[PDB]
């Protein structure tokens, strides 16, 4: 974050990164140049000495296709909020679902990771139209104790009776919903719950998954001290985990764990394991691995603005009828990255 | 905006806003998350004692749809200009049509309003390829007397005989045209005029509206003193007001009026009324309300960088065959917004 | 550029321009409003005394179409690199292919020019996934002598056997390739340059377009430049094999490209310019044989108010004829006048 403005009670931080990034894989849909950049603005204004206003916007700009290519940029975040002393904060916009308050603890790999869930995937990650109340250190009474309460209105179909103004396809639709999170402290533990109504299209068009509500239950653990980082994340889902392109898993059990070490000279090796186990899938699928891989990588930090990394995704999925029909990659991937950040 | 750069005779201002915005309506194409942001740059260079150069770019970035959604960002403004002492200024680019010099006076509602016209709508709002000459205080000789002269070259069809490089659909096309405005802060009075050629596609593809020329005639009045803001605008148009999706109104009579009070502690209540009366519509439509509503709302300004608002569009249109076939919404809307501004 | 941040060893230069721009032409696909803007960031971090990290992003935002129009903005450059003192620099991302190291010398017209090649056109201009090594002054041993070494992985088709993640159409595809450049600033203002590149072609390039067949794309370039005493002269000659676009018809099996320009910079701000460009395709299939792919004279001028504001006129005097080749290839044969007014930061 680069502070480019600080005057008359308002401050502007520009931030982002340019990632010179290349994948090598036998999977032709992921193989090759993956260069992209992120640019963002973070602003806050002191209204009075107890009230602060703020806004944040974050933009992704792909740079791996041509100048005539289509749909190469999109907004990751955009929200405005108010925070009042110890009474908490409230923001609204496109922001992270509060489930990520805990699952982000394992989303720290050099390149891969964080993919037992997706974006626009109920309240598991970045989401449209979330209203989020947060409180740090429980009103100033319990150090290290944080919680959040979140509401999301329906984001429905493009047309018909299920429509909203901002309609999308069924895999990124949501009904009215809410979520909570709680975290507590160099060992931390955390929990999160989310619950969203599912839409009619979601319960009629996809081949897999039927249920009134999408629900997630998460617990997580983190150790962060002495240049060691250990983290684990266990999430049980109902009608909320995508079964690739086929729909949603009626039930899934998602597990992420990671171990990293920071050498003083800048090298940060990382080792991790991720699995998403789908249960009670229709069509004879039954129990199926939705995700399963070991990840071995390393990032070298030249300083806080320059790094380079390699990441090896060791894919442990078998190619079977489920991964084939669902469009799920079973190939290994090697990622090489050179990153300038500000 | 925020001056982020001022060196060796050149200054840059960064400006914009993040609007956490939600609509509540029975109209499913309107109801839902409407979060968006704006970002712009305004540049100005001192060339010599009397001549300054300038440029400005304004970008709208929607943030209410997914990261895989399309067509989510667009340029509202982009122009470059020169200003010479009291002799006036010239600029060319994507800029406001001079009709907005007067109609902007009623475009002050918390969220709604300004919609008896649209963008890329001849010289009524933001438009491609406008060359604009402006003079304030009449060459320095008459305080408060401003005028503008403006030319716009054809923006034609995508292909065929009527094409230009930057072709678009008939509803946002224009032929060669020109406009003039005059405003006098005598309490202000304003008048504006525009005259454009229509295009062959406007006279053949849509069902409604036929004529060689699009014209508008605008008069406006503004009271802005003693914490009170009152404004009205009346615009008579020919072949220039859109009849929703069905074409243009051969004649239309547009009227906007607003009354507002600014409380010292930040609250700014607002009441307004807008109507657009189409005349001589083809296909038996005859005379039709194209727009008709009363608006009640309020903005609370925390400071220059943070505000919040409610706006209530009390829609007075009757649901009939014209509003149905033309895609014109007849439902009330409530907007809630929280805005961070830089 | 405008340096808007420089702290803790990291600096950010925000740069760009807003070009109020209008074309006049009998070609209705060219005529009319052409207003656009560029915006970009050039960033740089001093890692230690000898080692610098850097990144650069450049965005093009059209402003000549409506707010409901599609695909109006795009990324021209995005790369990150390291410079290790006199050992050289390495960057990767979307960047210029090293052929442009020499052909850029003629890319100086007020509005037109630089179009015997295109973008995403092997290593001839801006390109996806280029890894570029550069060395100035030959490890610090020979002032004025620069060279570059570049590699580009395949950017393939959208679907099927030749696909990559970042697929595109045949005119903008490439196989694995490499290029090299070498320039020497001879004395007071005279430079000579050479560039070479060699890429594999893709299957769709050998099947979808009507013209051009070959396993390999190859370019050979030499250039000359004079840049002193307010005079700017430059020329470049490039011979290509399976690498110059023949409009929408495909690729020319061979092409011979030539550009030459002469400009003078008045101190009061006026910069007149005259130039000539041609691209001659040879051995085209389907009876075309030898054809002019590009041929025009350019006359224009730019007036600099200062470093942040300018205006120009540019007049493309098009010498191509309307024939079945130019018709079927979609190549414009009409004259064009451009009028621009530019704010720069
Ligand atoms: C403000 O005045 C608006 C009303 O004036 C009407 C303009 O007259 C139109 C002139 O041509 C119309 C021919 O019927
Ligand atoms: C000129 O002043 C315009 C008068 O306001 C129009 C509102 O009344 C319209 C009823 O036809
Ligand atoms: C002349 C005083 C201006 C009156 C404006 C009042 C706005 C009322 O809206 C309140 C809701
Ligand atoms: C003071 C401004 O008050 C505006 C009224 O707000 C409308 C509330 O919307 C409720 C309608 O169902
Ligand atoms: C020798 C002919 O082979 C064609 C080479 O294609 C370009 C790939 O070269 C990359 C090796 O550095
Ligand atoms: Mg179920
Ligand atoms: Mg008429
Ligand atoms: Mg050949």
Residue numbers in the entry:
A (entry chain C): 0 to 184, 188 to 344
B (entry chain A): 0 to 185, 189 to 344
C (entry chain B): 0 to 344
Passage from the reporting paper:
Carbapenem-resistance in Klebsiella pneumoniae (KP) sequence type ST258 is mediated by carbapenemases (e.g. KPC-2) and loss or modification of the major non-selective porins OmpK35 and OmpK36. However, porins play important physiological roles and facilitate both the influx of small hydrophilic solutes, including nutrients, and the efflux of toxic products across the otherwise impermeable Gram-negative outer membrane. The overall structures of OmpK35 and OmpK36 display similar features to other general porins, a trimeric architecture composed of 16-stranded β-barrels. L3 is not exposed at the cell surface but folds back into the barrel, forming a constriction zone half way inside the channel that contributes to the permeability properties, such as size exclusion limit and ion selectivity of the pore.
The OmpK36ST258 structure can be superimposed on OmpK36WT with an rmsd of 0.43 Å over 340 Cα atoms. The structure revealed that the GD insertion in L3 of OmpK36ST258 resulted in an extended loop conformation that intrudes into the pore, at the constriction zone, which reduced the pore diameter by 26% (3.2 Å WT and 2.37 Å ST258 diameter). For example, the MIC to Meropenem is 1 mg/L in ICC8001, 8 mg/L in ICC8003 (encoding OmpK35ST258) and 16 mg/L in ICC8002 (encoding OmpK36ST258) in strains expressing KPC-2. This demonstrates that the WT OmpK35 and OmpK36 porins in ICC8001 allow sufficient periplasmic diffusion and bactericidal activity for this strain to remain below the Meropenem sensitivity breakpoint (2 mg/l), despite KPC-2 and OXA-48 mediated hydrolysis. While not diffusing into empty proteoliposomes, glucose (180 g/mol), the smallest carbohydrate tested, freely diffused across all OmpK36 isoforms, demonstrating formation of functional pores. Meropenem (383 g/mol) diffusion was significantly reduced in OmpK36ST258-containing proteoliposomes compared with OmpK36WT. Diffusion of lactose was impaired in the presence of L3 GD in OmpK36WT+GD compared with OmpK36WT.
